[PDB]
């Protein structure tokens, strides 16, 4: 209640603090090494670092100038840089440290060994109904979180999710996070995961989020996305009409939550209600839940992750204008 | 199959149902073809009424403490439901207010009345009006409701089937075939029609209010004394309904257990013939059927007070109401006729309307409760899933059937690729420690730990309808690499070339088309053809020969999926010498765990998982006068009695007549004497009322005829040939046995009465009226010549799709009674969904035929009704335009035609009804119809010459030109191959096929004696048991001949004794479902403890040691030296150590049967077979 009313202001007030003065060029590559390579992207490329002068192992993510440019992209990768380094949640990747050279652009971010929710998804086939509300109550007090800042996240899928040492997740690649109060009108994200109002062309709000959790809860249930077609085109079709169906060892709890989050007409979607982010918490498939323990991570994680090391990366696979680039 | 027309009428072309015309126009002059039925609107599909509900149900249960499901419905249904009760409200509204238009206009005809002559016209024209805003106000919303129901009960429907796949195994054993068939069964068409009737329960209350005051403006005071009757009356009818609801309760449990012993005794016929016990089956059938029909009996008595009350109210509610008025002051008879008129509304609202409504919403309401009671049973857990496991292990498995546990600290461990082969005797607990592995079965103890891919293969081959090829699919994409791979390693390629349409042989439910070895091994396959992680393999080498055994064990489980994890149920050393760990038990415990050395001491590469849920032309192919003189007729009483119902009808008419031509408190004129006519039409329906000394014996005869019926048609069935009794269904079966008797029993007795009452009415009043004015005859003739018509066009195409519509609730019960037969399969691959979508198609055919008899009965109704008012208006201004300065005498006559003929109509509906259902009569009739399949034993020598044999007359022959000799008192071995023909040879010994050639028992030739005697003579050992609901003592003997001493004396030489005693009510305990607590060889020796019961000189043993181990197959070789010594026993089997005690052997092979003396010849011969003798066997076949 009061608790978590008085403590949000909180967080508001400091991150003004940090989006008003920030600090930049922090570092640049004379103090990183180049030891593997974690990840790949579609525009990026993230690195395992560490720095002689501490010791202490970091990821690195690379971006190409040129082809930002070309991508017709730029304003949404300083916004990345910008958003990155003024949260504060202990379920987002914070951020060291910030580079500027001549060819590149690079960014600091904490190491996280237990590799992606994506790779042990696929691996294990499905995870059982605790397994995944484990998590989706995290996703749930990080969607809280950001919506307190008038901030969507607007990408979320399981290759976006990581796993540390305790098992919990921390949220990564806030390429396409923008401070939005009001209404917004670019199409950008992953087709699977993308809402009605997206695909017809028209404005959205902060609603997307909570339809992109219900996806992600029945992929994580299921094992397979709801609206699956071998093509983009024909997948619209399937997300417009909005007909899904469930498997048969779904709980009744569970489909009742997937259809009130799944729902096509965004005046009725939870999250959006009257209630706000409350309607989620009551719902009858998240009794068993204790908000305060899992924000202060003392539940005990149904997944370990066996890192074996800092060096160690065994949980992953085995892998010039300066006008518009002038907050790096 | 066209689009509905529906989808894209005129506004005008719905109002009036006009889009039905086509069908009509294509059905009177031919028969329907299947071109004619429409696809179904998209609004009435299964799959979307089926979201619709469930969507609601589930938010009713997650956000209620009390979830009810009538809250579900009503968030669905409610605000049409309502629409349509204003526009049905308004319509009656108009009905009440018709006499004081109709009224003044009758009053107009005489002189005196000069100020009602003055407006007669405007009058006219607002009656005209009337009629008009009546039509058209009815009919629409009556249609709308109607399709309202049917929605509700399909999405109810949906979701019972869907909660039938769920149900625990604990709970499971509770619930019977019966319950679920009469669940569906009530509920199929009269909760569609009851929506109709269940606004009046607020509609009835305002119009009485509405007609009291009308009724108070003639009679001041003196209306209450006539309301204070009907509130009597309706006090009574109350009273009526709850004891009628008290007997259908109490009858409602039998009718279960009847329809599961007819099932199960029609499903095994062959074994019924064989024993000869069809008598005793008909005896326990009539004796379920003799304690119900006195509940029936007792609430059609209840039911005919109960529908009486509206005739013999019709004069006391006027008399009563009427009399205190004309003693203080004189009464003229227009205010007489008008107080009839308000009275027949009122009567109709007070003692028709409002019960009906009553008991309409306690049905409604409870099936509704009994479907949620239904809904919320204890379910399955799903097994956990996880790829990475790799691993089967379990530790301290204990776990309890219900006492002794049936499992006692279990443990083992196996890996990735590895065989276990689990062993012991007969009853250790070997299905019961798979059941353990595949969640069937909860341990109290313990743990097991796999990913929770599994395939099953079931001791029991379960069958589901379709080809071989959908059989072995069973669900997913074909590929055809491993289709052929696990074909050819499952030795079906010989057997599938026999069969002339290959691979797609369409096989029926149970496939009894197959032979036993033959649908062992196509569930082998089908089992093979998964792909999973682990293999339960139930005891699949049961009814195979040793060779071709061998060849599967060396080519299918050994070789084609070596890489798999596996546990075979075996008992052979051969088996256990290749496995890896070998596990013994012994009445459920470990006695032995380890490998056999300390005894002593490719095509899975494809994701194939990855229908329509329409019907189309291929599942609409299924479904494509002398009736009444034939029911009449069955019973005299019935014919006694409707001559006496005319004896008294003719009196009455007599005595009233007479009285009528006969002719103060009561004022008549010589100008206004003319009411008497419209007065006596007014209240003939009380002077004609059939009381209870005519009404009890109709319906009494009604129920005997339907009770001669049915035994009529059991003892029909059970006499046919079998290949009669192969094509049918078991769906069809018991819709026949369900619906169709449940219908004859309470539907057709009480709609006859009705139908009959109203004819006796209209012709009475007719015939009286006529008598002393012959104009109205004239007058009434052209409206029934158009009714007539009318009638006789519509019945074309309404008895066509009635017999479809019938024929459509086969594939409903045909998929239930499969499913549940396999229920641990289907939730062992994964099937679910599959049997879902089919589901909905028979749901879907269903409704495509009911729609259509739907819209067409509505249109019938709509043009009777408009006939009707065309006539009144016509009638109407030539009766107010004719009268000039004086009497109007055409008027009168008019109108009092048009009086008689609005009973007419209201007989015409009823008349239709009573056709709708005659139906069930003639289906009845037609299954009567099939046609009939028709000391001495000193020695037992038996003598065959030229023995020809085939399943269809014209079809292929299994044997041909067999002929050979028995001596009296010999053991003769008859082996072969897998589906050889080693049954259809027994088969042919007790003529249960079509049969040509010649056998002798003692010089007694088959063609001399009758058939019953035939099969006397011989004992059998079938190779299916045969097990119904009952006592351990009545399945051992049905014919109540042995006492227990015998009894005991047979269980104890047989081994059962220890069977029996662990069960609390030794031989009086009530076996269930087939005997599903015994093992598979307590079945065998419970048929062998029957066939030592009856003593037989000539024995037919189909393989009577089947599934057993060497240990237990001791006590059949004991019993066939020391019961049998003295007889002529033919032991056909597959265990090699049984030809040992044989003195004579028969071969199949190539159709024919070849004769041997010794074993050791016929071994010699034959090396392949010789080569696959086990050793054991080896030594002792060659000392
Ligand atoms: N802190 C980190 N620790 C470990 N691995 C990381 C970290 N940050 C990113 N990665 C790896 O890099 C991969 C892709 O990087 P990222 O998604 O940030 O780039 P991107 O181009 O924005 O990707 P996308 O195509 O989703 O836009 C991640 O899936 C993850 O494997
Ligand atoms: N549904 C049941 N309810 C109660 N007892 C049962 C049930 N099913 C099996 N049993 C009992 O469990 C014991 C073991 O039976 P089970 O069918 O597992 O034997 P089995 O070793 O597979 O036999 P077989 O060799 O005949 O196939 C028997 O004593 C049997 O009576
Ligand atoms: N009702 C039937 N209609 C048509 N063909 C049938 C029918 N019953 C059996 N057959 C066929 O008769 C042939 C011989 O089968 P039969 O059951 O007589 O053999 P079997 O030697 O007793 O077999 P098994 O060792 O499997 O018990 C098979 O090809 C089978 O398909
Ligand atoms: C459907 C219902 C609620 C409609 C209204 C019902 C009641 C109020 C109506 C129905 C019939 C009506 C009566 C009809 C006829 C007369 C005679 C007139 O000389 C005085 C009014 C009087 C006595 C009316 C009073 C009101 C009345 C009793
Ligand atoms: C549903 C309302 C019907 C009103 C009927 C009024 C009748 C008035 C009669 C006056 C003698
Ligand atoms: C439902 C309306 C009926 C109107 C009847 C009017 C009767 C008028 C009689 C005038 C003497
Ligand atoms: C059951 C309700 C009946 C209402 C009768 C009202 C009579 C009104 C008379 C006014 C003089
Ligand atoms: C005095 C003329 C009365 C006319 C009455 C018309 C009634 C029309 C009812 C629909
Ligand atoms: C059907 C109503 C007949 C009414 C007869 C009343 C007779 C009264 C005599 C005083
Ligand atoms: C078709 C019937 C017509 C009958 C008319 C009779 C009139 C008789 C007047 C006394
Ligand atoms: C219901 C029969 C109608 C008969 C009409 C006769 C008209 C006669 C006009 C003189
Ligand atoms: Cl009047
Ligand atoms: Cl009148
Ligand atoms: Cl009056
Ligand atoms: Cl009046
Ligand atoms: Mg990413
Ligand atoms: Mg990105
Ligand atoms: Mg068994
Ligand atoms: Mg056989």
């Given at each position: 209640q009061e608790s978590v009313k008085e403590f949000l202001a909180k967080a508001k007030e400091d991150f003004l603090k940090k989006w008003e003065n920030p600090a930049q060029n922090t570092a640049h590559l004379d103090q990183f090494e180049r030891i593997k390579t974690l990840g790949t992207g579609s525009f990026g490329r993230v690195?395992?670092?560490?720095?002689?002068?501490?010791?202490?192992?970091?990821?690195?993510?690379?971006?190409?100038?040129?082809?930002?440019?070309?991508?017709?992209?730029?304003?949404?990768?300083?916004?990345?840089?910008?958003?990155?380094?003024?949260?504060?949640?202990?379920?987002?990747?914070?951020?060291?440290?910030?580079?500027?050279?001549?060819s590149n652009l690079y960014m600091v971010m904490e190491y996280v060994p237990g590799g992606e929710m994506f790779s042990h998804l696929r691996r294990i086939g499905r995870f059982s109904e605790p397994h995944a509300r484990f998590y989706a109550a995290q996703i749930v007090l990080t969607f809280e979180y950001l919506h307190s800042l008038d901030l969507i996240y607007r990408d979320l899928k399981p290759e976006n999710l990581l796993i540390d040492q305790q098992g919990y997740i921390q949220v990564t690649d806030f390429g396409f996070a923008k401070r939005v109060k009001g209404r917004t009108?670019?199409?950008?994200?992953?087709?699977?995961?993308?809402?009605?109002?997206?695909?017809?062309?028209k404005g959205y709000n902060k609603a997307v989020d909570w339809w992109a959790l219900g996806v992600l809860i029945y992929e994580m249930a299921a094992g397979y996305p709801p609206f699956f077609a071998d093509q983009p085109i024909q997948i619209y079709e399937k997300i417009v009409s909005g007909k899904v169906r469930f498997p048969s060892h779904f709980s009744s709890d569970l489909k009742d939550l997937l259809r009130?989050?799944?729902?096509?007409?965004?005046?009725?979607?939870?999250?959006?209600?009257?209630?706000?982010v409350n309607d989620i918490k009551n719902h009858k498939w998240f009794a068993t839940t204790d908000w305060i323990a899992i924000y202060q991570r003392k539940v005990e994680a149904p997944f370990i992750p066996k890192f074996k090391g800092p060096g160690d990366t065994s949980n992953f696979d085995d892998y010039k204008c300066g006008k518009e680039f002038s907050e790096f | 199959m066209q689009r509905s027309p529906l989808e894209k009428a005129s506004v005008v072309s719905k109002l009036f149902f006009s889009w039905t015309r086509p069908i009509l126009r294509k059905g009177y002059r031919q028969r329907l073809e299947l071109s004619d039925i429409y696809q179904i609107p998209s609004v009435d599909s299964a799959d979307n009424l089926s979201e619709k509900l469930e969507r609601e149900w589930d938010r009713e249960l997650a956000s209620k403490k009390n979830p009810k499901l009538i809250n579900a419905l009503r968030r669905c249904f409610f605000w049409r439901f309502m629409f349509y009760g204003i526009f049905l409200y308004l319509g009656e509204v108009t009905k009440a207010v018709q006499p004081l238009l109709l009224g003044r206009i009758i009053a107009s005809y005489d002189p005196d009345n000069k100020e009602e002559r003055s407006i007669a016209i405007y009058l006219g024209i607002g009656l005209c009006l009337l009629f008009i805003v009546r039509t058209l106000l009815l009919h629409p919303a009556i249609f709308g409701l109607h399709h309202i129901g049917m929605q509700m009960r399909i999405a109810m429907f949906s979701l019972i089937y869907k909660k039938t796949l769920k149900l625990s195994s604990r709970v499971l054993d509770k619930i019977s075939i019966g319950q679920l068939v009469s669940l569906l069964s009530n509920n199929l068409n009269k909760f569609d029609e009851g929506l109709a009737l269940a606004h009046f329960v607020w509609i009835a209350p305002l119009q009485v209010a509405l007609l009291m005051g009308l009724i108070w403006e003639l009679l001041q005071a003196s209306a209450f004394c006539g309301l204070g009757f009907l509130i009597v009356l309706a006090l009574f009818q109350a009273g009526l309904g709850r004891m009628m609801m008290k007997y259908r309760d109490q009858r409602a449990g039998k009718i279960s257990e009847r329809l599961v012993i007819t099932s199960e005794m029609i499903e095994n016929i062959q074994s019924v013939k064989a024993y000869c016990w069809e008598e005793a089956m008909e005896k326990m059938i009539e004796n379920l059927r003799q304690t119900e029909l006195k509940l029936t009996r007792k609430a059609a008595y209840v039911r005919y007070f109960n529908s009486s009350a509206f005739f013999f109210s019709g004069f006391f509610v006027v008399f009563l109401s009427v009399l205190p008025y004309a003693l203080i002051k004189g009464i003229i008879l227009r205010k007489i006729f008008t107080t009839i008129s308000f009275c027949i509304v009122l009567r109709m609202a007070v003692t028709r309307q409002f019960p009906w409504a009553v008991q309409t919403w306690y049905d409604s309401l409870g099936a509704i409760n009994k479907i949620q009671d239904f809904l919320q049973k204890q379910e399955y857990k799903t097994l956990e899933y996880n790829l990475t496991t790799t691993e089967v292990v379990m530790e301290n498995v204990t776990a309890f059937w219900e006492g002794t546990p049936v499992l006692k600290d279990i443990n083992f461990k196996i890996e990735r690729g590895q065989l276990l082969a689990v062993a012991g005797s007969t009853g250790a607990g070997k299905t019961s420690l798979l059941m353990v592995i595949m969640g069937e079965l909860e341990p109290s103890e313990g743990k097991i730990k796999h990913s929770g891919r599994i395939s099953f293969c079931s001791q029991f081959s379960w069958i589901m309808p379709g080809t071989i090829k959908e059989n072995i699919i069973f669900g997913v994409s074909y590929d055809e690499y491993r289709y052929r791979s696990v074909i050819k390693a499952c030795q079906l390629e010989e057997d599938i070339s026999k069969f002339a349409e290959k691979d797609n042989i369409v096989l029926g439910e149970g496939g009894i088309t197959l032979s036993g070895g033959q649908r062992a091994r196509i569930s082998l396959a089908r089992a093979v053809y998964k792909d999973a992680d682990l293999y339960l393999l139930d005891s699949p080498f049961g009814y195979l020969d040793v060779l071709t055994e061998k060849e599967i064990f060396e080519s299918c489980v050994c070789k084609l999926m070596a890489n798999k994890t596996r546990i075979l149920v075996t008992s052979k050393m051969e088996h256990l010498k290749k496995a890896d760990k070998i596990l013994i038990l012994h009445e459920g415990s470990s006695y032995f765990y380890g490998t056999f050395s300390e005894l002593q001491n490719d095509i899975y590469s494809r994701r194939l998982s990855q229908i329509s849920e329409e019907i189309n032309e291929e599942d609409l192919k299924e479904c494509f006068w002398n009736t009444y003189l034939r029911y009449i007729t069955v019973h005299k009483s019935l014919i006694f009695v409707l001559i006496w119902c005319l004896v008294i009808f003719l009196a009455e008419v007599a005595a009233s007549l007479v009285v009528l031509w006969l002719l103060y408190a009561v004022i008549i004129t010589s100008t206004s004497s003319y009411y008497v006519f419209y007065i006596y039409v007014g209240v003939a329906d009380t002077l004609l009322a059939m009381g209870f000394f005519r009404g009890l014996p109709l319906v009494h005869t009604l129920i005997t005829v339907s009770k001669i019926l049915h035994h009529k048609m059991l003892h029909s069935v059970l006499q046919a040939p079998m290949s009669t009794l192969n094509t049918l269904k078991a769906g069809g079966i018991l819709n026949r046995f369900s619906k169709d008797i449940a219908i004859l029993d309470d539907l057709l007795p009480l709609t006859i009465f009705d139908f009959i009452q109203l004819l006796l009415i209209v012709i009475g009043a007719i015939a009286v009226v006529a008598v002393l004015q012959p104009y109205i005859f004239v007058a009434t003739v052209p409206v029934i010549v158009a009714f007539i018509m009318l009638r006789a066009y519509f019945l074309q195409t309404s008895q066509?799709?009635?017999?479809?519509?019938?024929?459509?609730?086969?594939?409903?019960?045909?998929?239930?009674?499969?499913?549940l037969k396999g229920l641990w399969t289907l939730r062992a691959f994964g099937r679910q969904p599959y049997f879902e979508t089919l589901f909905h198609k028979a749901l879907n055919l269903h409704t495509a035929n009911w729609f259509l008899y739907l819209s067409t009965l509505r249109w019938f109704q709509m043009r009777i009704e408009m006939i009707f008012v065309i006539f009144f208006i016509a009638v109407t201004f030539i009766s107010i335009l004719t009268t000039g300065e004086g009497e109007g005498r055409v008027g009168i006559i008019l109108t009092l035609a048009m009086n008689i003929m609005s009973t007419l109509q209201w007989a015409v509906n009823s008349s239709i009804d009573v056709d709708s259902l005659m139906r069930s009569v003639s289906r009845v009739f037609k299954f009567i119809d099939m046609p009939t399949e028709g000391i001495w034993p000193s020695g037992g020598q038996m003598t065959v010459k030229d023995l020809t044999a085939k399943y269809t007359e014209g079809g292929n022959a299994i044997l041909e030109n067999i002929s050979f000799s028995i001596s009296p008192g010999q053991r003769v071995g008859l082996l072969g191959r897998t589906g050889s023909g080693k049954s259809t040879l027994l088969s042919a010994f007790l003529r249960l096929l079509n049969t040509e050639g010649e056998i002798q028992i003692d010089g007694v030739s088959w063609d001399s004696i009758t058939l019953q005697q035939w099969r006397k003579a011989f004992g059998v050992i079938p190779q299916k048991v045969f097990i119904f609901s009952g006592t351990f003592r009545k399945n051992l003997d049905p014919y109540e001949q042995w006492s227990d001493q015998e009894i005991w004396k047979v269980a104890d030489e047989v081994g059962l004794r220890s069977v029996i005693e662990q069960f609390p009510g030794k031989l009086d305990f009530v076996l269930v479902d087939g005997g599903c607590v015994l093992s598979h060889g307590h079945k065998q020796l419970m048929?062998?403890?029957?066939?030592?019961?009856?003593?037989?000189?000539?024995?037919?043993?189909?393989?009577?040691?089947?599934?057993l181990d060497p240990v237990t197959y001791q006590i059949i070789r004991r019993t066939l030296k020391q019961a049998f010594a003295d007889c002529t026993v033919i032991l056909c089997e597959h265990r090699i150590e049984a030809m040992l005690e044989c003195q004579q052997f028969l071969v199949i092979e190539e159709n024919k049967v070849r004769q041997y003396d010794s074993i050791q010849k016929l071994l010699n011969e034959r090396s392949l077979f010789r080569q696959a003798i086990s050793p054991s066997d080896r030594v002792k076949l060659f000392p």
């Open positions: 690195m395992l670092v560490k720095h002689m002068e501490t010791g202490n192992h970091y990821a690195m993510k690379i971006l190409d100038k040129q082809k930002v440019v070309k991508l017709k992209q730029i304003e949404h990768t300083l916004n990345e840089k910008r958003i990155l380094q003024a949260v504060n949640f202990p379920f987002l990747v914070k951020l060291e440290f910030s580079f500027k050279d001549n009108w670019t199409l950008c994200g992953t087709p699977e995961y993308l809402a009605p109002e997206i695909i017809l062309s009130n989050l799944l729902q096509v007409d965004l005046t009725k979607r939870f999250g959006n209600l009257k209630n706000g | 066509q799709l009635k017999q479809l519509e019938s024929e459509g609730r086969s594939p409903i019960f045909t998929h239930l009674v499969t499913s048929c062998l403890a029957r066939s030592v019961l009856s003593k037989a000189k000539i024995l037919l043993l189909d393989q009577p040691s089947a599934h």
